[PDB]
Design a protein around this nucleic acid. Sequence first.
DNA 1: TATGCCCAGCATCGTTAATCGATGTATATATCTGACACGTGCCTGGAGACTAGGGAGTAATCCCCTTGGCGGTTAAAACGCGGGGGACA
Length: 41
Amino acid sequence: GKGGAKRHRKVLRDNIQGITKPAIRRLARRGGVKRISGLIY
DNA sequence: TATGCCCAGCATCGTTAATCGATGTATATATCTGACACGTGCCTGGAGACTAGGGAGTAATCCCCTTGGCGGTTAAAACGCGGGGGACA
């Protein structure tokens, strides 16, 4: 349970976590559906 | 004359043996078809050989384009909350 010279570096440009979820919904409505499931996207 | 007694007489039942015919099983032979390999014959579409030429290889230079680093705002992604209306039975 220590500071231990901790350095934090994780990867969120390329990797799919990093990309933006609204970026998708932005996409979803152009099609014009009313609803987005969590599972689906 | 009628009623019990002697002497044949074919069909009743069963059992033995020979015979025509059906069923099962080899066993070497005469068709049936379907070939794949060979030689028959011929064509030339490939092989073989040579040339000539221009594509593509490489090498030597250039300079443009792509990646990088950085920092400021400023929108966007992210989160959550809440409740309605669509999914699903």
